[PDB]
C-alpha cells in the first residue's frame, strides 16, 4: 500500500517534542502542552514526489525501561533525537538516547536525525559547530529548528524520512 514511516521523537523533558510534532501534525505552535502525555499521530505528506504517511510518536514520561518499552522503541524505523539550543544538559544527554535507540533496534546504523531546537531564542547555550561535530560523529544529519516560529520543522521531519529511505536501499 501506501509507504508509512514510523518516526520516534526523543529527547528530554522541555526540549520541543510536543510542539515540534504539533507543528507537524496541526500547524500552530501549542504551547505548555500536558508535559506527561506520550501520544502518537499520522498524518499524509507527499515528500519529494511520495505520498506518504507519516506515523510520529510523541515520547513522554518517567525513564523506566522494561521490555514493553524497548518493544514499542524498536517499532521505530527512525529517530528524531532533539534538544534545546539554550539547554547544555539535553544535548549532553542525546547520547544516551542514540545508546539506547541502537540497544533496541540492534543494530549501528538506524537512521537518525539530531535537532536542535528553540532556534528562535537569544539564551543559546549549545553553539552550532558542537551540534554539527556530534552529529558528524554519528554520521547524520544536524537541523536546527523552533517550532515557535515553525522554522526547520518540515525539514527536520522530511529529512527523517530521506534517511529511512537511505537505509533501506543499504
Ligand atoms: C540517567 N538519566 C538521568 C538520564 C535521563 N535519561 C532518560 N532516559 C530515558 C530512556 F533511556 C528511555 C528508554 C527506555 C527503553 O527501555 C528503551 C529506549 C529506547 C530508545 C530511547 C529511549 C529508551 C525512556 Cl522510555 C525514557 C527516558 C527518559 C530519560 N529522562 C527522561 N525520560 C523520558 C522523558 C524525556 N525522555 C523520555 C520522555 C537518562
Ligand atoms: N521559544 C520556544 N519555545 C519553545 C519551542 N518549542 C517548545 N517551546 C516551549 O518549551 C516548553 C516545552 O515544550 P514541549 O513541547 O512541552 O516539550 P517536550 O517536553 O519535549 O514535549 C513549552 O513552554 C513550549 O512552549 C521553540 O522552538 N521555541
Ligand atoms: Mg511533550
Given at each position: 500500500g501506501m509507504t508509512e514511516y514510523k518516526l520516534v521523537v526523543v529527547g528530554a523533558?522541555?526540549?520541543?517534542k510536543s510542539a515540534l510534532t504539533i507543528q507537524l501534525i496541526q500547524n500552530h505552535f501549542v504551547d505548555?502542552?500536558?508535559?506527561?502525555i506520550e501520544d502518537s499521530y499520522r498524518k499524509q505528506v507527499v515528500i519529494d514526489g511520495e505520498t506518504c504517511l507519516l506515523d510520529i510518536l510523541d515520547t513522554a514520561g518517567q525513564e523506566e525501561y522494561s521490555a514493553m518499552r524497548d518493544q514499542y522503541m524498536r517499532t521505530?524505523?527512525?529517530?528524531?533525537?532533539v534538544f534545546a539550543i539554550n539547554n547544555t544538559k539535553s544535548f549532553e544527554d542525546i547520547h544516551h538516547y542514540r545508546e539506547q535507540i541502537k540497544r533496541v533496534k540492534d543494530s549501528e546504523d538506524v537512521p537518525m536525525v539530531l535537532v536542535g531546537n528553540?532556534?528562535?531564542?537569544?539564551?543559546?547555550?549549545?553553539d552550532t559547530k558542537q551540534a554539527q561535530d556530534l552529529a558528524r560523529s554519528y554520521g547524520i544529519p544536524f537541523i536546527e529548528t523552533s517550532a515557535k516560529t515553525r522554522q526547520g520543522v518540515d525539514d527536520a521531519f522530511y529529512t527523517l524520512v530521506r534517511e529511512i529511505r537511505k537505509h533501506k536501499e543499504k
Open positions: 523533558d522541555g526540549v520541543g505548555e502542552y500536558d508535559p506527561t521505530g524505523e527512525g529517530f528524531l533525537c528553540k532556534c528562535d531564542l537569544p539564551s543559546r547555550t549549545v
